[PDB]
């Protein structure tokens, strides 16, 4: 299965030139950029692991491209994403996020159904990779 | 274990001639026919996967037999079922359903018991095939 989190997941994996252009668009707005990693893709897993501090005043995509290159050869198999933050009054939140590295294969998830009162069910979403191996060796 | 969902599961697997006769009975009533597939046989799994659109005005079982033949050679190991729908005022629901293809072997299910207040138990039914492999490779 293909994980569909992010804004461009219905398009093929993007090339390095493609990635650089999107970065160039965020810096022209004055946004701060950062890179994150994880091996637990549950949709309610809000905090991915941080790769260094956010690049606040960098004004050249080459600096962002370099950091991503390092993570790629340094981190274990899993997922990598690039985010952009806007600290303007009225926003003070993230304004863009897309995946930029995936595992060789992802088995996906399945549902568990606990029966409670009347006809009500309490659902739990479960990951095949997580349940099988500890962090660092899931993919 | 043998899954007992459907109207003829206490009888041996039906032959192609047997299946054709039941189809001929539903079309003489004017019902619409469709074919579905799944690899998760939980009794509360209401939505199986659809194989094309329902055949509304087809008036010859040969058309239904052909579609079932295709699914058999196209879909992965699992279960296949044929349903008949009646859109008449007062009904507007399914009026027949039977299994027409099974996996080589089905391990079945087991129960988990969570203890709550007093002597009350919250039960959960679990499938051996589902918990072991992702969709597409369970059988």
């Amino acid at each position: 299965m293909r994980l569909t989190q992010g804004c461009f997941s219905f398009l093929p994996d993007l090339t390095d030139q493609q990635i650089e252009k999107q970065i160039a668009y965020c810096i022209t707005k004055g946004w701060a950029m950062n890179v994150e990693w994880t091996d637990d893709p549950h949709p309610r897993n809000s905090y991915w692991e941080l790769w260094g501090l956010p690049l606040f005043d960098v004004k050249d995509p080459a600096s962002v491209m370099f950091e991503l290159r390092e993570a790629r050869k340094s981190c274990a198999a899993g997922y990598i994403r690039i985010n952009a933050f806007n600290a303007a009054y009225g926003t003070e939140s993230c304004v863009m996020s897309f995946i930029v590295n995936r595992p060789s294969n992802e088995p996906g998830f399945y549902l568990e159904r606990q029966e409670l009162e009347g006809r009500r069910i309490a659902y739990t979403t479960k990951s095949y990779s997580v349940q099988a191996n500890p962090e660092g060796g899931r993919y | 274990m043998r899954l007992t969902q459907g109207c003829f599961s206490f009888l041996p697997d039906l032959t192609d001639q047997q299946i054709e006769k039941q189809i001929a009975y539903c079309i003489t009533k004017g019902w619409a026919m469709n074919v579905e597939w799944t690899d998760d046989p939980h009794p509360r799994n209401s939505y199986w996967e659809l194989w094309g659109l329902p055949l509304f005005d087809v008036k010859d079982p040969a058309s239904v037999m052909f579609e079932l033949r295709e699914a058999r050679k196209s879909c992965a190991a699992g279960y296949i079922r044929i349903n008949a729908f009646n859109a008449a005022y007062g009904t507007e629901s399914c009026v027949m359903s039977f299994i027409v293809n099974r996996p080589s072997n089905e391990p079945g299910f087991y129960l988990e018991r969570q203890e709550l207040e007093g002597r009350r138990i919250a039960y959960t039914t679990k499938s051996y095939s589902v918990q072991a492999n992702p969709e597409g490779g369970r059988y």
């Binding site: 088995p107 099988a132 191996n133 060796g137 993919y139 | 992702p134 490779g137």
Partner: peptide
Amino acid sequence: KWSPRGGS
């Protein structure tokens, strides 16, 4: 060896 054993 303990990573490819499970989670295909």
